[PDB]
Amino acid sequence: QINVSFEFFPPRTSEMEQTLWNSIDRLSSLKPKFVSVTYGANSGERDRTHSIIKGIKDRTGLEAAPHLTCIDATPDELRTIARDYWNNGIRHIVALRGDLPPYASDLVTLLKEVADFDISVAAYPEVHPEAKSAQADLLNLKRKVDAGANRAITQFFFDVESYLRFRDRCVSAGIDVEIIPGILPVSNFKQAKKFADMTNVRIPAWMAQMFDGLDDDAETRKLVGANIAMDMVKILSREGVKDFHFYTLNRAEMSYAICHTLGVRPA
Amino acid sequence: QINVSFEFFPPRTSEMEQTLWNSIDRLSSLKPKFVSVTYGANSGERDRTHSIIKGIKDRTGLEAAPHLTCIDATPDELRTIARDYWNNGIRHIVALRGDLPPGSGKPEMYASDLVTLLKEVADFDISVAAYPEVHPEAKSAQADLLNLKRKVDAGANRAITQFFFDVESYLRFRDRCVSAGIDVEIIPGILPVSNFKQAKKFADMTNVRIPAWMAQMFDGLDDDAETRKLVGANIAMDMVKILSREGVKDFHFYTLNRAEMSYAICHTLGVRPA
Amino acid sequence: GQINVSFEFFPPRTSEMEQTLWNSIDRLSSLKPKFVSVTYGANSGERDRTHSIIKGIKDRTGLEAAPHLTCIDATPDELRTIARDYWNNGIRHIVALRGDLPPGSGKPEMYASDLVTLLKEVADFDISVAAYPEVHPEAKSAQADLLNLKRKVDAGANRAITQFFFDVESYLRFRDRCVSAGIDVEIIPGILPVSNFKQAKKFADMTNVRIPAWMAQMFDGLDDDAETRKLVGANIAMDMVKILSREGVKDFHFYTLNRAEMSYAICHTLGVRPA
Ligand SMILES: Cc1cc2nc3c(=O)[nH]c(=O)nc-3n(C[C@H](O)[C@H](O)[C@H](O)COP(=O)(O)OP(=O)(O)OC[C@H]3O[C@@H](n4cnc5c(N)ncnc54)[C@H](O)[C@@H]3O)c2cc1C
Ligand SMILES: Cc1cc2nc3c(=O)[nH]c(=O)nc-3n(C[C@H](O)[C@H](O)[C@H](O)COP(=O)(O)OP(=O)(O)OC[C@H]3O[C@@H](n4cnc5c(N)ncnc54)[C@H](O)[C@@H]3O)c2cc1C
Ligand SMILES: Cc1cc2nc3c(=O)[nH]c(=O)nc-3n(C[C@H](O)[C@H](O)[C@H](O)COP(=O)(O)OP(=O)(O)OC[C@H]3O[C@@H](n4cnc5c(N)ncnc54)[C@H](O)[C@@H]3O)c2cc1C
Ligand SMILES: [Hg+2]
Numbered sequence A: 001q002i003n004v005s006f007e008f009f010p011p012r013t014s015e016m017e018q019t020l021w022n023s024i025d026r027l028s029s030l031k032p033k034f035v036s037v038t039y040g041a042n043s044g045e046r047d048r049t050h051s052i053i054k055g056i057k058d059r060t061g062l063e064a065a066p067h068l069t070c071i072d073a074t075p076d077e078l079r080t081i082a083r084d085y086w087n088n089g090i091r092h093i094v095a096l097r098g099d100l101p102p103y104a105s106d107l108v109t110l111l112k113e114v115a116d117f118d119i120s121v122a123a124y125p126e127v128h129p130e131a132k133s134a135q136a137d138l139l140n141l142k143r144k145v146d147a148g149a150n151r152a153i154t155q156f157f158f159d160v161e162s163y164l165r166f167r168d169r170c171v172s173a174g175i176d177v178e179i180i181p182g183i184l185p186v187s188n189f190k191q192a193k194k195f196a197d198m199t200n201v202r203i204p205a206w207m208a209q210m211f212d213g214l215d216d217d218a219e220t221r222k223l224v225g226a227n228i229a230m231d232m233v234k235i236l237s238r239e240g241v242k243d244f245h246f247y248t249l250n251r252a253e254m255s256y257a258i259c260h261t262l263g264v265r266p267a
Numbered sequence B: 001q002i003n004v005s006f007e008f009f010p011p012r013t014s015e016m017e018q019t020l021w022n023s024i025d026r027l028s029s030l031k032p033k034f035v036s037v038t039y040g041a042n043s044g045e046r047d048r049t050h051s052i053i054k055g056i057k058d059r060t061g062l063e064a065a066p067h068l069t070c071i072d073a074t075p076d077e078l079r080t081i082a083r084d085y086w087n088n089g090i091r092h093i094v095a096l097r098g099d100l101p102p103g104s105g106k107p108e109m110y111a112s113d114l115v116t117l118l119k120e121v122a123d124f125d126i127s128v129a130a131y132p133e134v135h136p137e138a139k140s141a142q143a144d145l146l147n148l149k150r151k152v153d154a155g156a157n158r159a160i161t162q163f164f165f166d167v168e169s170y171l172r173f174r175d176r177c178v179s180a181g182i183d184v185e186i187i188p189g190i191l192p193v194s195n196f197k198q199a200k201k202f203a204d205m206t207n208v209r210i211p212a213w214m215a216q217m218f219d220g221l222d223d224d225a226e227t228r229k230l231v232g233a234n235i236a237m238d239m240v241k242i243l244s245r246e247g248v249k250d251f252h253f254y255t256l257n258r259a260e261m262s263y264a265i266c267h268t269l270g271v272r273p274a
Numbered sequence C: 001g002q003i004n005v006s007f008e009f010f011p012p013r014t015s016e017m018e019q020t021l022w023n024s025i026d027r028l029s030s031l032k033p034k035f036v037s038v039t040y041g042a043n044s045g046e047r048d049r050t051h052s053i054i055k056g057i058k059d060r061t062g063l064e065a066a067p068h069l070t071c072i073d074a075t076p077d078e079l080r081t082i083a084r085d086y087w088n089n090g091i092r093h094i095v096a097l098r099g100d101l102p103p104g105s106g107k108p109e110m111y112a113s114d115l116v117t118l119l120k121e122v123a124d125f126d127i128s129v130a131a132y133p134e135v136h137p138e139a140k141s142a143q144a145d146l147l148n149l150k151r152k153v154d155a156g157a158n159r160a161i162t163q164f165f166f167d168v169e170s171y172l173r174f175r176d177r178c179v180s181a182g183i184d185v186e187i188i189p190g191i192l193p194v195s196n197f198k199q200a201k202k203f204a205d206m207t208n209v210r211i212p213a214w215m216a217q218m219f220d221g222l223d224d225d226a227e228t229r230k231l232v233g234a235n236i237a238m239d240m241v242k243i244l245s246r247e248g249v250k251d252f253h254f255y256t257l258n259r260a261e262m263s264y265a266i267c268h269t270l271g272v273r274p275a
């Protein structure tokens, strides 16, 4: 069967707060394998990440996986955060290094020492913008797995071939874990392009065309974005992929629809 | 060169207050590397610790090191206290877990956690407790030794030992610290004994063994304070002499707010006024 | 006073050995040992005897009895059943060992740390494990063996009991290396009082334990002299135990070989007497 997960982020406004909880309720009915909440380098927000995971696990009963970054934190602190999480029933965590202020493998090992955690790590089909080469980054992923990562969630992508080729290189390199694709339903192209430029993610020429001229047409953008996303998962699904991780951005509709086309429906 | 330090406790009464300041004036002339003040569980020995430290600093200009306990303090309260000290020129703190009151027994925060917390605030000089005869609540002698290394690794500059009457206890313990990689000065704590009945009470509750020969020395002197002072001073002076011959260059005296005995012992140690 | 002692007995193989054992237990019980333990053999009969002697000790003396348990010839499920039964019967302290590998057809895949883990899953037992000041014969390195000890302690072991030794420096350096590896349990020295030297040499040869030249000299020529051997062996044991105590050791485990006199006397010099 198809397993899906949804990724949310801590809301920064009263409106965004309500929007989030509505989407959480709406998406819980699809029974995802788990849901994750992002974490950014900000003490108060770090507290917010905690509270949201707790609230989720407490009102839906779904498995909630918090993101944790190696950046700006001492090993003893990280260990206490881990023990505090495990103690609160939160046995799944997404281990990352973190966006640097103007390593991951170590955080994996750190967490495994504390407890037999279910760890998820980041994979880069188009190479992390910092690694010196495709191979170096590929080997790093392997290290993170060897350290104890159960799953590998990729950064969003638009070129299906880039992902399929990467997935092959992973197995060819001995990585025995699933490379769960990260899907970004695009409704705002302008914003998507900004994200891609940062993450080194390539936006194919054809996609640029699809959004050309839709700047003021919010409705058409959602229609075109959903179409593009549904095509993606259709191909990925036929190619053997049975696990999808959605970057909801606290919005339910597009992911809900895409899930419906995958057969992921309420029951 | 021999270095010394003296430990005082917050006076609860007017008479005790006077004795303390007299001792401070007497002992200050020896120019000790530092002087420290106890931090108990009650406000009497808690609020006062701060006052006495300010007093000492103003009246003599000697480095005063306050003792700090995490017992009934939130990490927030501890940081507040640490910032105040640092900002006011206090660069040395004696970080301790603290004597938990026999009632509630919660294995939560430990001294190493306090050390870490203090180092997050500023580059303090932290002194921690060491036990040559093992801390009475330790899992084992090895665990207690590992705890000392943990505190040194957390940022402790030096270790001050609990008092002892068997010089060999100190000597073996120091050898173990070195073999274990603990690279800081293991300052022996010296308790000049004037009253034996009171010394037995302290050692009893501290797991410190009192040799039979020492109990023999004070036997029959229950009402002879003058002879107890002479005998006790003799015992301390000999212990201190042995330790020096063995390489110890730093001593920490538990004055109990009384200056006479500690002053005399320091004199024979060669540490005298200018 | 502040010194704890424990005695180790093995299941007797004859009627004569049995009378000797119970006698030793009666005599040694007066010293109020922290606990007594009983060895675990490989054959079915022995293993049953271990259980009965532990029961006999518990009833007859009311002392804390700790049986040994190995991985040899047992499925994880047999082991759990045995452990559950032990716990329900009041015996809540086990000496967990992998066990002496028999010269037959069976490669070791399960080790002592695995047994500790399995035992911990059953109940909160007090678990004691084996330590080797002179390195276990099969260890590929002293580092491996020491890290293995840490592994067993991490799994749940409350204390370590070392293989016997004749060179105190070996115990002392090992006690130090244990701290350097982060092992936080007290390593209790295993004391083997020797009266029969040839037999002691046998045990040593097969355990990678070194007998100092001076010690061999001490027993040279005393083969047919049981009396002298007992005095010489007691003197040696007493000196070693004396040095250990001056070095801080306050816990001792005696390999009695079911005999009481030597361990009794050595205990007496430590100050552990009947009251
Ligand atoms: C599913 C997902 C979720 C994310 N969630 C968050 C989040 O909640 N918060 C957040 O801040 N960020 C998040 N990110 C972004 C991520 O933290 C950044 O891309 C960051 O730069 C890398 O984190 P990482 O775990 O991939 O780092 P790493 O795996 O450590 O790799 C990062 C870089 O280091 C390199 N590398 C690794 N080890 C070595 C080494 N020893 N020597 C040299 N180079 C080395 C790699 O090749 C690469 O260039 C997420 C990413 C993904 C895909
Ligand atoms: C120089 C000196 C000055 C002192 N001054 C004072 C004072 O001003 N005020 C006061 O109240 N008391 C004072 N004390 C006494 C001290 O607070 C008590 O001895 C207290 O019981 C332990 O303090 P500690 O700092 O040694 O704690 P710790 O170093 O934390 O050790 C306490 C115990 O816990 C164990 N332990 C440590 N970590 C762990 C762990 N993770 N798990 C389990 N066990 C662990 C240790 O082995 C030890 O048994 C002083 C002691 C000395 C020697
Ligand atoms: C106090 C004491 C009591 C004893 N009582 C008995 C008894 O009642 N019955 C009995 O049959 N025997 C007994 N013995 C002997 C003991 O069983 C043997 O010495 C045995 O060969 C190992 O037991 P162990 O528990 O040390 O094994 P372990 O701790 O598992 O180690 C045995 C060997 O395996 C190695 N090792 C550990 N883990 C691994 C790994 N994962 N991969 C590779 N090598 C590894 C160790 O380094 C060592 O060389 C006793 C020994 C002692 C010291
Ligand atoms: Hg980091």
Ligand SMILES: [Hg+2]
Binding pocket: B069, B070, B071, B072, B097, B098, B109, B110, B111
């Ligand atoms: Hg505390």
Ligand SMILES: [Hg+2]
Binding pocket: C070, C071, C072, C098, C099, C110, C111, C112
């Ligand atoms: Hg086994």
